[PDB]
Amino acid sequence: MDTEKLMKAGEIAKKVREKAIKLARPGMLLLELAESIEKMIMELGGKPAFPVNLSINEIAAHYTPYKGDTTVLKEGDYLKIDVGVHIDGFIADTAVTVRVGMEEDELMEAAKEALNAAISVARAGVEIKELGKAIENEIRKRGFKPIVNLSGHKIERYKLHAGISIPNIYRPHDNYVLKEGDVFAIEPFATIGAGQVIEVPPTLIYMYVRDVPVRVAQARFLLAKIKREYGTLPFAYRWLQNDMPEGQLKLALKTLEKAGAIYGYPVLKEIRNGIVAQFEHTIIVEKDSVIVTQDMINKST
Amino acid sequence: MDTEKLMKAGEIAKKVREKAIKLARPGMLLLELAESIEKMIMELGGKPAFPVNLSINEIAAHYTPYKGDTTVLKEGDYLKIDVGVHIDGFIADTAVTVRVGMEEDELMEAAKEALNAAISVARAGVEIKELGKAIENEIRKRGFKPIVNLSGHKIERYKLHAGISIPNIYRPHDNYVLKEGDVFAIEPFATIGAGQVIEVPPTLIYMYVRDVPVRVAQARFLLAKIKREYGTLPFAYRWLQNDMPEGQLKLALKTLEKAGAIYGYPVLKEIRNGIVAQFEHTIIVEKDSVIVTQDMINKST
Ligand SMILES: [Co+2]
Ligand SMILES: [Co+2]
Ligand SMILES: [Co+2]
Ligand SMILES: [Co+2]
Ligand SMILES: [Co+2]
Ligand SMILES: [Co+2]
């Protein structure tokens, strides 16, 4: 059922996340890491909810390797491993920051404790603004800044971002009350920069939006492909690299973007190039003591 | 009818808004201005969707006069007039900034243009992120900063803040898709300060949030009155200053808050005391959105 499938996605996400952390050592090629992770997900009976994100230092999110990517992990690098798994549409979304070859530092602890404080107050009947306050307080109290344009989000079947979000700053009108059964991802983002991310090249992730008319055949068929293979879930440029020539692929995606058929999600980096840390868990809201699907499994595997 | 009542609410809000501007002259007592406005709304056949807010300079919002308030408008003051009207629950929400006894300046122009830019791209099928994008670019381009924790919001029957917001900055994940029938208030806030607001005393606005048991007789009766006359819409401390002595009223309100029956909304000011400008309109999504808070429009295509 619902809960069962969700917890199952959570269990897989957890195993996959731990393995990634163990593989995230100096010299490790990002492409190999992303591949191993997505492979483990399928062999465990699940499917990726989106391409595994591996964002380093000032890159906050939306970075997933591509065939030919020579990028490798370096000691001291602040690697954000964001993995998502779904079972029949029920999504588990989790993330961690690892400082390659080193222990967690103050900045990383800020994001992790912000997440703990948010889960501590997150329960049925509480307004979202309360989580934002708790998150903002932990980050600023420790001397860092929260990212104002990246945060948590409601999750629904086959819908990574259901609409309602969980800010990392307190907003007086976030009066939305968490209901039992609600599925939310809480993602505190802390930085030493300004506290805002900007889009920058290249675009490695895309998502299907609408079924608009496309005159260009190659683009029109790429859309029909995307629509049925990925549906409403994010996909990686990497996942399509062996389908058609790089050149043609790049132009077909661009056409779909301008046509408004799909949305491109380029790399997000801190505006002042500030190091970014992130931690995330998916939880099921319940009358007090919410369940953390990506913790130790406590609902219905 | 449905859309009929909504349009009517906007008609009244518009007339009252334009009248408030004419009355916003040097020496005008805030208490007098609010009273005149709220009185005009009722004689016009409508009811305040909330107490008329009159927020000056670094005060962004949530300020409404009270019995005994001697504050008056001073020439050169950046007064933001935010007025709301509802017809049987259908709410119209609009606002404008006026530089008392003077003409529009740089800051004000930015906020107003930001609102026009959002409305321009607002149509069924568009993701909210596109509104935030247009808003931020108009404000940033003129050298000002948009307030990151105060913005637009979805509106529903007897529900000023439905849940979904329209930020004044670009957030990559605000993927909510505007759909026909949707009612939204676009509320750009611009400042020369840091770009964030904080809650500060006093608390002049409250709002019924939950039907919780209240034993205390005096506080219990006050709650019955609230639910009876204000329902789930915001109300002013001012609207209750004639029912009982200040002391009892304060304790009564504190008791209702402690029980979690009502929620207080304290004044909001720019964190760096920077001047704040605001402009706002309520729209109803269609094949091509229509502004509720303005004179009616033809068919055309
Ligand atoms: Co994302
Ligand atoms: Co995630
Ligand atoms: Co997430
Ligand atoms: Co408000
Ligand atoms: Co308003
Ligand atoms: Co509003």
Swiss-Prot record, chains A, B:
Its cofactor is: Co(2+); Zn(2+); Mn(2+); Fe(2+)
Q: Highest taxon of the source?
A: Archaea
Q: Residues that bind substrate, according to the entry?
A: H62, H161
| Reactions it catalyzes | Release of N-terminal amino acids, preferentially methionine, from peptides and arylamides
What keywords appear on the UniProt entry? Aminopeptidase, Hydrolase, Metal-binding, Protease
Q: Which residues bind a divalent metal cation 1?
A: D82, D93, E280
Please name the PROSITE patterns in this protein's record: MAP_2
Give the matching CDD domains: MetAP2 (cd01088)
Q: What are the GO cellular component annotations?
A: cytoplasm
Q: Fetch the Pfam families from UniProt.
A: Peptidase_M24
Keyword field contains Cytoplasm = no
Task: Tell me about pH and activity.
Answer: Optimum pH is 7-8.
The cofactor remark states:
Binds 2 divalent metal cations per subunit. Has a high-affinity and a low affinity metal-binding site. The true nature of the physiological cofactor is under debate. The enzyme is active with cobalt, zinc, manganese or divalent iron ions. Most likely, methionine aminopeptidases function as mononuclear Fe(2+)-metalloproteases under physiological conditions, and the catalytically relevant metal-binding site has been assigned to the histidine-containing high-affinity site.
- The record's top EC class is hydrolase
Q: Would the keyword Oxidoreductase turn up in this protein's UniProt record?
A: no
Q: Which family does it belong to?
A: Belongs to the peptidase M24A family. Methionine aminopeptidase archaeal type 2 subfamily.
On assembly, the entry states:
Monomer.
Q: What's this chain's function?
A: Removes the N-terminal methionine from nascent proteins. The N-terminal methionine is often cleaved when the second residue in the primary sequence is small and uncharged (Met-Ala-, Cys, Gly, Pro, Ser, Thr, or Val).
Protein name, please? Methionine aminopeptidase
| Organism encoding this protein | Pyrococcus furiosus (strain ATCC 43587 / DSM 3638 / JCM 8422 / Vc1)
